[PDB]
């Protein structure tokens, strides 16, 4: 296949979480949630994430309850069996922008914006692909490229023509921690956030892995000593043969 | 008389794990058998646990796997352990089979354990294929579709058989629910066959790297091979740890994190890496039925090694030409694997056909010729 | 405590001659009517008490208990029920 | 009897072939017989008996 | 427990389907469907039965398609993702009178009318219980019985006080086959129909059972002959002992 | 040498089903072992098939069982076969255990097969209990609730253990999904223990109705007991046919056709009939923990029969007093069963306590006394 059909391969960026012993940067995760909420969430759902999931990762219990309580969710029917709404709770999932696929496609010139909860695992490249894609819209398509109507040129996307236009521009978000919201900064934060959404066990997993590595290595060393100890009578055996 | 010998139940365990007389010179390639038993125990423990949280219905399957990853305590570990151990199982089984081929473990009097071994290998393939479908991601669905459509090649009844396997007209809910039931069952069948091949082996005992009798010099299985097995157990657990904790998705396909969609076809539909050489063999034959036969023959041809090996000596340790041929055979098998996942494009189409011919010609031509000539060189060379 | 054919663990046998005839030479249902009537009657008569006595006792116990329970939950059994609880 | 024995019974290959062929015949004839008997004992009751009204 | 707490036990009526070799009477099943549709279906659902299930049991393909096509079912959303309705198809399930439990209870003074698809298996007595209950409302409760509000006396119902009033009265239905629609006739037909709804394999099952009984009995007889044949050398063995 | 004897795999089969030396006088009560093997095979075949169509999620479980009854070809048969064979399994296991108790099969040298047998019986109970929950009808839920709450009686940790079993704070979806995985597993464990008790038996061979050695007079297992087993197989299949085709719900509870409702409690919650005697024993002790201990002890006490039977003679064929005591013990066991399903009302409360005392006093007092006296009567009476 041509390189265009594959898509350009994203650079390997030095993410804070790259590194056997490295967690996510939680300040970046929190900023990335704010980019998601103010930019991506207009078209993209995050359906696998509940409000409780933010708590003690990016937000306190109170902040997350406040986010949940601002929304309305379907309650159980009332006593006459009529539909009712209730305010959100921490157990609720973050609600998506569209009621169904048909509505999503209608709002996006036929294209369906994927749910972003697993996107960092569902694409080769992970965070690097998300960062490269969001920051990789050239001002002008390479001469000779014919885009289908409603497509935008992006070399990272396979085939080059993506239905999502560029959305991150300097200062579309005002971060609450005073960080300059440049295109690059926002793409980095949201790519970190989405990586966390895909693999929220990441930090715990790598710490447990460190404990396992240490114990298993020591056991490997001791198992070598013990095997050699037990085998030495066999290895050291000597023979004298006197032919009968 | 010691209880371990007197009591019939204890004596069965004793005969296999304690007093079992082993050659004193088994090298580390004799440790893959216990690693395979370890993989089987991990897969049973993790598999039964995933079954407690998984839902086989197509509307819930993919989400039940996300629930395992996200909500079940240590669910991420149990899931990644199960998924990665499936790959480790195939690395160990290829190593165990390669050991057997290099050292002549298929020769008399060990034809029967080898032949039951070939069936174990087929059951492992089926088990792993069905388990991969259970995720119900894009690769799950599309891999089930293309692999199950190979059955359509069976003359006359092939289409009917496919609809019967699917329980409908395409891969859907009925297929997923039956794959769950069979995926749960097949590891128990596999454990029975693994036990059968060991009982069959017990009549001759283990072969050894020199290819000679060990009846002159035996060691108890315990403590010597118990403690030697611990070294490779911990080496295996270190590799396991590096994948499961530090790179849990290295061996997987990102498309399996997209929910199955019968409309959209993924860019490239490939089997899991361990099935790739057989897929390359199938692509090499242009005919559908031809390709299926070749692919099955590539496994069943292992059954003729006892016949086509004409050597008067067991194993390759002392056979320089056989050792070179074996090296080329193994590397060709890896190249077939690589060709199973390239695009059907020049020049890989022809290369795949040449590698397929080499694969079969090892069994049918080269090993019979080389083993004949080496017999003569040993005789003339030592006169 | 059991060997196998040829060394089963029997004390030495001597002095017994055993005889039988082919299944094709015999009538498999020879004497069936006599057996079915007289042999079954003998075998059943000799075991009858060991079944009848416990069955009849436990059936009587049940019958008395179930009848009392039924009576206690009628109008007539109101007072006796009140005492029983 | 000798002839019958010699052709159908003496060789087990022939005996098994005869048993399987008889099983095939039995299966097809028994199906038809039960279907007719079932229809006679349940006459006027089954859908096939009232279908003509509709 | 008191007899009242148990409920009176229904008589054993001689149903056509009683009898190892007996099917349902399908003319009664068809009439029972009509009672269901015109009386019971106001309060009771039959959710496990699809229109296709009636076909070749009580109705032809065309009659059942006509019943389905008169109703509206929820379709997939249109292209703007707005809800749509479609006409019914044979694959559709028979729709219930109420959208949820709360609406059902609101319409029935708090009582919830059960779904009737399994009722013949879900009550001791089966058809006899349904027939007895429907026909067993006395004009006046036995002297001394105090009914809770919204309850009706019926001795077959455990405790006596049922939230369902009598509904079958002579001529509430006009049968299409000219049968006099008395209380007893309608109760018999609807009880037959509901028994069919609970166990629609009934007729096929009992015929397959007849084939199994015949084959298995013959095999039992032959197995006795063969066992006796093979055992006769052992049974017939005789001994002569000459003590050494 | 014949192949069946020479080849080690064939020789294992040969030793159990063909050349196996049997007493020549086994009566029809020695046929329950093969009926139990038949039930186990039917339950595996029907159970794995139901697993292909069943959904373990609490939102879909009960409906998946209705889909089996209504839509799956022959689903009604597979479901009713599985449900009724569970009852037949218990009839055969009670007959097999009663045979063992009457004929002294638990005595030396058969203590080990008997003791493993007691564990098989416990695994059957657990298997059947979990399978009944899978329907998720009213009896499924409420039986799981009541039985799992008995674990709360374990001191200190009981409550914690219950929440751990349920995977939540009441019986719900997590409990159903775990019961499905374990219900699938437990029959395979049960098959292994069934095989273990046969291997343990093979050292002494089958006992026989006279209680004497059969080493003097052995018959091959095949053809004699193969053909004698066919008679009871066909008798079993006739009983199976009458229930499965003509009365499929006779052995069941109508409330299990109502979907589980955690709010409404059914009129009476009883276990399936085969657990009823143990339930009556539990009711007899007023204390919760006392009752659980008694109920478990009622099964584990079978382990002491080898000790408390003081007879110098094996089995009851020639012991008139032991035969009467055995008759009363069996009928009392049936009365306990009946009392397990009556209401907790007079006079059944006291009667249940008397029957419970009789149950335990058989093992602890009566059998040791009666067997002692009969020893003396045999000796004095034959002087
Ligand atoms: C996956 C799960 C993890 C578990 C890992 C288990 C793997 C262990 C194993 O079987 O291999 C170790 C194994 C060491 O086993 P060993 O029992 O010491 O000797 C086995 C050989 O037969 C002895 O072979 P040798 O004595 O002739 O020594 C040959 C070996 C040198 O082997 C030494 O270890 C030295 O060096 C090479 O063959 C390298 C080839 C040259 C490349 C340049 O390593 C090899 O020898 C690998 C050679 C394969 C090609
Ligand atoms: C469930 C699945 C269905 C499969 C059916 C399997 C049942 C077969 C079985 O074990 O019982 C047949 C079994 C016949 O077995 P058999 O090998 O002829 O004799 C075993 C005894 O030695 C027979 O003891 P016996 O020779 O002393 O003869 C006594 C027997 C007469 O035994 C018969 O031949 C009948 O009659 C009675 O004991 C009747 C009790 C008196 C009530 C009045 O019948 C009985 O023994 C019933 C008596 C049990 C009380
Ligand atoms: C890649 C190519 C491998 C070729 C091996 C050639 C022999 C060699 O150097 O190996 C070292 C050793 C040589 O050991 P050896 O036992 O022959 O000799 C020991 C030393 N002397 C001769 C002095 C007694 O070979 C092994 O240990 C071979 C085991 C083969 C395992 C293959 C796994 C491949 C999986 C694919 C499955 C299909
Ligand atoms: C109900 C009470 C039954 C008691 C049986 C008493 C003996 C008798 O008459 O039986 C006939 C026969 C007598 O057989 P027998 O072997 O003692 O005598 C044969 C005949 N003579 C004496 C001439 C050699 O007993 C059996 O076959 C008994 C098997 C017991 C099975 C019980 C199942 C109950 C399950 C409850 C589980 C806990
Ligand atoms: C699992 C449960 C096992 C018990 C089976 C009993 C009956 C089930 C058979 C199904 C059935 O209804 O068959 C009927 C006939 O029964 C019969 O004639 C079957 C009774 C036979 C008893 C057992 C004989 C062998 C069965 C087991 C062997 C299976 C594997 C071996 C290869 C009629 O059905 P139908 O006649 O309409 O059927 C179409 C062919 N005309
Ligand atoms: C108003 C529309 C819109 C906004 C705003 C938007 N997207 Fe998208 N996005 C889409 C559409 C439409 C597609 C589907 C494009 C296609 O498949 O052609 C898409 C696709 C994607 C993809 C997948 C591309 C692929 O490989 O399939 C990722 C990742 C993505 N968006 C992330 C984001 C992030 C991160 C943001 C903002 C911070 C964002 N999107 C903002 C409309 C939007
Ligand atoms: C307008 C209301 C209404 C009509 C009409 C009606 N039912 Fe009911 N039915 C109920 C209610 C309410 C209950 C629940 C009563 C209770 O549990 O107290 C019920 C309960 C039942 C029960 C179960 C009683 C039990 O054992 O739990 C059966 C069977 C039944 N109905 C059948 C029918 C049949 C058959 C018809 C008509 C041919 C019918 N019903 C007509 C309201 C109705
Ligand atoms: C030889 C043993 C086994 C092998 C090789 C094996 C292989 C696999 C594979 C490859 C998958 C796909 C994993 C993924 O990518 O997510 C899988 C999934 C699964 N397996 Fe197994 N398996 C085995 C034994 C078992 C057993 C005994 C069970 C018991 C039920 C089981 C239950 C499951 C379940 C529920 C899943 C789906 C959830 C998931 O994907 O993790 N497996 N198996
Ligand atoms: C579940 C998969 C398997 C397990 C658990 C297993 C286990 C074992 C074990 C423990 C041994 C004895 C120790 C050893 O030599 O390594 C062994 C020997 C053997 N296995 Fe396997 N095995 C499996 C699959 C296979 C396969 C697929 C084959 C053949 C294609 C095979 C063929 C043999 C042979 C021929 C031997 C004898 C080798 C010798 O000692 O010379 N096995 N196996
Ligand atoms: C000793 C073997 C077994 C016993 C005693 C047993 C017992 C039971 C029982 C009592 C039920 C409730 C039946 C009902 O009322 O509907 C049940 C249900 C079930 N069993 Fe088993 N079972 C056994 C083996 C198996 C096996 C091996 C499987 C394999 C998965 C299995 C799968 C099921 C399934 C899916 C259900 C639920 C569907 C239904 O209720 O019919 N069973 N089992
Ligand atoms: C899955 C359940 C079981 C199966 C398939 C099974 C199968 C068998 C078989 C085939 C035999 C040899 C033939 C016979 O005597 O009937 C046997 C013997 C025996 N079984 Fe079981 N059994 C099971 C459960 C049990 C249980 C629960 C016990 C004890 C509590 C038990 C104790 C014994 C004993 C003691 C013997 C030797 C009896 C003798 O021949 O004297 N078994 N069993």
Instruction: Transcribe chain A into DSSP letters.
Output: --HHHH-PPPP----TT-STT----HHHHHHHHHHHHHTGGGT---TT-BHHHHBTTTB-HHHHHHHHHTSEEE----TTS---EEE--TTSBPPPS-SSHHHHHHTTTT--PPPSSSHHHHSTTTHHHHHHHHH---SS--TT--PPTT-EE-TTSTTSEESSPP---TTSS--TT-----HHHHHHHHHHHHHHHH-TTHHHHHHHHHHHHHHHHHHHHHHHHHHHHHHHHHHT--------
* Burial (CB count within 10 angstroms: exposed 0-12, middle 13-18, buried 19+), residue A1: exposed
In the residue annotation, B319 being an active-site residue is answered as no
Q: How many CB atoms sit inside 10 A of residue A118's CB?
A: 23
**Ligand 3 center–CA B330 separation, angstroms:** 11
Q: Whose CA is nearest to atom 7 of ligand 8?
A: B128
Query: Do E157 and E226 lie in a common domain?
Result: no
Angstrom CA distances, B206 to A52, B22, B198, stand at: 57, 7, 10
> Ligand 6 in contact with A123 (CB < 6 A)?
yes
Contacts of E193 (CB under 8 A, 6+ apart): E28, E29, E31, E32, E33, E35, E36, E58
**Ligand 6 pocket check for A44: Cβ under 6 Å:** yes
User: Do A72 and A156 lie in a common domain?
Assistant: yes
Which is nearest to B151 in space by CA: B143, B160, B162, B140? B162
Residue A243: which domain range? 201-244
| Chain B residues within an 8 Å CB radius of F174 | 52-53
Q: For residue C54, how far is its CA from the centre of ligand 4 (angstroms)?
A: 13
Yes or no: say if F326 and F317 are a contact pair by the CB < 8 Å rule.
Answer: no
Question: Is B26 in contact with B206 (CB distance < 8 Å)?
Answer: yes
Nearest Cα to Cα of residue B22 among B231, B210, B214, B232? B214
Task: Please choose, from the candidates E137, E131, E141, E115, the residue with its C-alpha nearest in 3D space to the C-alpha of residue E197.
Answer: E115
Helix (H, G, I), strand (E, B) or coil at F281: helix
In this structure, the dihedral spanned by the alpha carbons of residues A220, A223, A229 and A230, taken in order and rounded to 10 degrees, is -150
What is the spatial distance between Cα E171 and Cα E111, in angstroms, rounded to a whole number? 27
Task: Give the residue from F374, F380, F359 showing the smallest Cα distance to F320.
Answer: F374
CA distance E102 to chain A (A): 4
The shortest C-alpha distance from C37 to chain F (Å) reads: 19
Among candidates E138, E94, E137, which has minimal Cα distance to E116?
Answer: E94
Cα–Cα distance between B113 and B120 in angstroms, integer?
10
Distance of CA D36 to the CA centre of its chain: 12
The chain C residue lying nearest F219, using CA atoms, is: C5
Q: How far, in Å, is the centroid of ligand 3 from the Cα of B102?
A: 7
Q: Which residue has the tokens 């990644």?
A: B80
Verify whether residue F56 is a known catalytic residue.
Answer: no
CA angle A106, A111, A116 (to 5 degrees): 110
Closest residue to atom 33 of ligand 10, CA basis:
F47
Contact between F8 and B200 (Cβ < 8 Å): yes
- Cα–Cα distance measured from residue E50 to residue E64, given in angstroms and rounded to the nearest whole number: 10
Could you say which of B57, B177, B200 has the minimum Cβ distance to residue F52?
B177
Method of determination is cryo-EM
Q: How far is the CA of B96 from the centre of ligand 9 (A)?
A: 6
Q: Are residues A77 and A170 in the same domain?
A: yes
d(CA F24, CA A101) in angstroms, rounded, equals 75
**Is F202 an active-site residue?**
yes
Q: What gap in Å lies between CA E169 and CA E135, rounded to an integer?
A: 9
How far lies B182's CA from each of B27, B187, B189, E158, F49, in Å? 37, 9, 10, 46, 9
CB F62 within 8 A of CB F137: yes
CA dist., res. F51 & res. B51, Å (int): 12
Q: Which residue reads 């464990």 in tokens?
A: F189
Residues whose beta carbon lies within 6 Å of some atom of ligand 4: C 47, 50-51, 54-55; F 29, 94-95, 97-99, 102, 209, 317, 323, 326-327, 330-331, 333
Nearest CA to ligand 8 atom 6: B128
Assess contact for F68 and F79: CB atoms under 8 A.
yes
Residues C70/F335, Cβ–Cβ less than 8 Å: no
CA distance D39 to D10: 42
The tally of domains found in chain E comes to: 2
Residues C66 and C83: their CA atoms lie apart, in Å, by 18
How many other CB atoms sit within 10 Å of the CB of residue B145? 18
Q: Which of E121, E217, E234 sits opposite F238 (nearest CB)?
A: E217
- Of these residues, F53, F67, F222, F228, which one is catalytic? F228
Nearest to E230 among F227, F245, F345 (CB): F227
Substitution site in B82, B126, B181 for ligand 8 pocket (most atoms within 8 Å of beta carbon): B82
Sequence ranges of the binding site of F: 82, 96, 183, 197, 202
Residues 6+ apart with CB under 8 A from F292: F150, F153, F282
Ligand 5 pocket test, pick from F81, F89, F243 with the greatest ligand atom count within 8 Å of Cβ, gives F81
Please tell me the distance from the alpha carbon of residue F260 to that of residue F145, in angstroms, as a whole number.
Answer: 11
The answer, yes or no, to whether any atom of ligand 9 lies below 6 A from the CB of B100, is yes
Measured between alpha carbons, how far is F181 from B170 in angstroms, rounded to an integer? 27
DSSP annotation of E59? B
* Triad F163, F264, E35: Cα angle to 5°: 140
Contact F186, F123 (CB under 8 A): yes
Residue A74 tokens, joined: 């379907």
CA distance F101 to F32: 14
Query: Burial, A81: exposed, middle or buried (Cβ in 10 Å; 0-12, 13-18, 19+)?
Result: middle
Q: Could you state, in order of their start, the residue ranges of all structural domains in chain D?
A: 1-54
Any bridge partners for residue F23, and if so which? F218
Whether the link from the prior residue into F203 is cis, omega within 30° of 0, is: no
Q: Where are the alpha helices (DSSP H) in chain F?
A: 3-6, 8-17, 32-51, 61-70, 75-102, 111-133, 138-148, 158-166, 173-201, 221-241, 276-284, 288-300, 305-308, 320-339, 348-361, 367-382
Cβ contacts of C40 on chain F, cutoff 8 Å: none
What is Dmax (Cα atoms) for chain B? 74
The alpha carbon of residue A106 is apart from the nearest alpha carbon of chain B, in Å, by: 18
- The whole-angstrom separation of Cα A152 and Cα A160 is 8
Closest residue to A81, CB basis, from E77, E78, E106: E106
| φ/ψ (deg, to 5) at A197 | -60, -35
How many B-F residue pairs are in contact by the CB < 8 A criterion?
Answer: 69
Verify that E36 and E136 share a domain, yes or no.
yes
Instruction: List the end-to-end C-alpha distance of chain A, in Å, as a whole number.
Output: 75
E35 in ligand 7 pocket by Cβ < 6 Å? yes
Q: How many residues does chain C have?
A: 85
The owner of tokens 């860019």 is B267
Q: Residue F191 CA: which ligand 11 atom is closest?
A: 1
Q: Residues F296, F298, F304, CA angle at the centre, nearest 5°?
A: 110
As a whole number of angstroms, the distance between CA F107 and CA D13 comes to 48
A/F touch flag: 3 or more CB pairs below 8 Å: no
Give the residue among B303, B257, B309, B382 at the shortest CA–CA distance from B112.
Answer: B303
B274 touches B87 (CB < 8 A): yes
Bridge partner list, E50? E93
Give Rg (Cα) of chain A.
Answer: 26
Q: Are residues E60 and E43 in the same domain?
A: yes
Beta carbons of B238 and A213 less than 8 angstroms apart: yes
Contact between E216 and F245 using a beta-carbon 8 Å cutoff: no
Which of A98, A76, A96 is CA-nearest to residue A85?
A76
- Ligand 3: residue of B104, B319, B330, B358 to mutate (most ligand atoms within 8 A of CB) is B330
Which ligand is nearest the CA of F76, by number? 10
What is the Cα–Cα distance from F258 to F266, expressed in whole angstroms?
10
Residues with Cβ < 8 Å from A241, sequence gap 6 or more?
A: none
Cross-strand bridge partners of residue C7: C4
Q: Could you tell me if residue D44 is left (phi over 0), alpha (psi between -120 and 50 degrees) or otherwise beta? A: left
Q: Beta strand A85-87 with A72-74: parallel, antiparallel or unpaired?
A: antiparallel
Name the 3-class secondary structure at B137: strand
Q: With residue E166 as reference, give the H or E element that holds it.
A: none
Residue list for the binding site of E for heme c: 40, 43-44, 123, 129, 163-164
Contact between residue F101 and residue F215 where contact means Cβ atoms under 8 Å apart: no
Interatomic CA distance for residues E15 and E22, integer angstroms:
10
DSSP string, F284-317: HSSSHHHHHHHHHHHHHGGGGHHHH---SS-SST
The answer to whether E129 touches E10, Cβ cutoff 8 Å, is: yes
**Ligand 9 pocket, B336 CB below 6 A?**
no
SS3 E72: strand
With beta carbons less than 8 A apart as the criterion, state whether B208 and B23 touch: yes
Instruction: Mark whether A185 and A70 lie in a shared domain.
Output: yes
Q: How far apart are CA E200 and CA F168, in angstroms?
A: 38
Partner-chain contact B57 F57, CB within 8 Å = yes
Give the distance, in angstroms, between the CA of residue F62 and the centroid of all CA atoms in the same chain: 26
In the structure encoding, which two tokens stand for residue B366, read together?
């080269």
Residue A159 and residue A229 in one domain: no
List the catalytic residue out of F56, F206, F207, F371: F206
Please tell me the distance between residue F88's alpha carbon and the centre of ligand 5 in angstroms: 18
């Amino acid at each position: 296949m041509t390189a265009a059909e594959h898509g350009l391969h994203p650079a390997e960026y030095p993410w804070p979480q790259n590194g056997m012993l490295s967690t996510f940067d939680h300040a970046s995760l929190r900023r990335g949630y704010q980019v998601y909420k103010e930019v991506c969430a207009a078209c993209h759902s995050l359906d696998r994430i509940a409000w409780r999931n933010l708590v003690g990762v990016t937000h306190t219990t109170d902040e997350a309850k406040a986010f949940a309580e601002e929304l309305e969710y379907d309650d159980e029917p009332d006593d006459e069996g009529n539909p009712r709404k209730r305010p959100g709770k921490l157990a609720d999932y973050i609600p998506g922008p569209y009621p169904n696929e048909q509505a999503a496609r209608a709002a996006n010139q036929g294209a369906l914006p994927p749910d972003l909860s697993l996107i960092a695992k569902a694409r080769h490249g992970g965070a690097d692909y998300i960062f490269a894609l969001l920051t990789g819209y050239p001002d002008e398509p390479p001469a000779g490229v014919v885009l289908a109507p409603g497509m935008n040129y992006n070399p990272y996307f396979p085939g080059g023509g993506i239905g999502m236009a560029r959305t991150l521009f300097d200062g579309v978000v005002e971060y609450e921690d005073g960080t300059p919201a440049t295109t690059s900064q926002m793409a980095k934060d949201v790519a970190a956030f989405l990586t966390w959404a895909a693999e929220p066990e990441h930090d715990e997993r790598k710490k447990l892995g460190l404990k396992a590595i240490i114990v298993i290595s020591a056991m490997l060393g001791l198992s070598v000593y013990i095997k050699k100890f037990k085998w030495s009578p066999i290895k050291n055996r000597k023979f004298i043969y006197n032919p009968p | 008389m010691a209880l371990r010998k007197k009591n019939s139940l204890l004596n069965m365990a004793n005969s296999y794990v304690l007093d079992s007389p082993q050659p004193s010179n088994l090298n580390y390639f004799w440790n893959f058998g216990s690693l395979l038993a370890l993989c089987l125990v991990i897969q049973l423990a993790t598999g039964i646990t995933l079954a407690m949280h998984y839902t086989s219905h197509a509307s819930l399957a993919f989400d039940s796997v996300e629930h395992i990853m996200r909500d079940v305590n240590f669910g991420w570990f149990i899931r990644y352990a199960h998924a990665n151990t499936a790959s480790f199982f195939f690395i160990c089984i290829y190593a165990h089979m390669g050991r057997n081929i290099y050292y002549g473990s298929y020769k008399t009097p060990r034809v029967l354990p080898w032949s039951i071994g070939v069936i174990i290998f087929l059951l492992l393939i089926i088990t792993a294929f069905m388990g991969y479908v259970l995720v119900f991601g894009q690769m799950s669905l599309w891999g089930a579709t293309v692999i199950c459509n190979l059955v359509s090649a069976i003359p006359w009844l092939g289409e009917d058989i496919v609809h019967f396997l699917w329980g409908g007209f395409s891969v859907g809910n009925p297929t997923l629910q039956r794959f769950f039931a069979l995926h749960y069952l097949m590891p128990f069948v596999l454990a029975v066959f693994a036990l059968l091949h060991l009982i069959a082996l017990h009549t001759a005992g283990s072969s050894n790297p020199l290819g000679i009798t060990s009846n002159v010099d035996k060691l108890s299985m315990h403590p010597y091979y118990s403690f030697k097995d611990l070294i490779t157990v911990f080496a295996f657990l270190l590799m396991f740890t590096l994948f499961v904790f530090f790179s849990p998705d290295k061996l997987g396909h990102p498309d399996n994190y997209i929910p199955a969609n019968p409309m959209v076809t993924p860019a490239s539909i490939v089997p899991e890496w361990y099935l790739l050489p057989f897929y390359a063999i199938l692509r090499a034959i242009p005919d559908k039925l031809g390709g299926v036969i070749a692919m099955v023959a590539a496994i069943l041809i292992l059954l003729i090694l006892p016949i086509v090996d004409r050597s008067i000596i067991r194993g390759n340790a002392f056979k320089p030409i056989s050792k070179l041929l074996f090296g080329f055979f193994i590397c060709n098998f890896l190249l077939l694997g690589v060709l199973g996942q390239v695009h059907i494009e020049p020049p890989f189409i022809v290369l795949g056909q040449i590698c397929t011919i080499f694969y079969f010609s090892y069994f049918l031509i080269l090993l019979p010729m080389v083993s004949t000539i080496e017999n003569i060189f040993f005789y003339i060379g030592s006169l | 405590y059991m060997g196998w054919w040829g060394h089963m663990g029997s004390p030495p046998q001597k002095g017994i001659a055993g005889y039988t005839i082919s299944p094709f030479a015999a009538r498999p249902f020879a004497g069936v009517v006599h057996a079915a009537i007289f042999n079954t009657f003998r075998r059943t008569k000799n075991q009858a008490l060991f079944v009848i006595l416990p069955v009849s006792f436990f059936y009587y116990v049940w019958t008395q208990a179930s009848e009392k329970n039924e009576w206690l939950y009628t109008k007539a059994g109101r007072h006796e029920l009140a005492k029983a609880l | 009897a000798t002839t019958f024995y010699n052709v159908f019974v003496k060789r087990n290959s022939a005996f098994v072939a005869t048993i399987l062929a008889s099983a095939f015949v039995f299966d097809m004839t028994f199906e038809t017989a039960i279907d007719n008997f079932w229809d006679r004992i349940n006459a006027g009751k089954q859908w096939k008996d009232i279908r003509h009204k509709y």
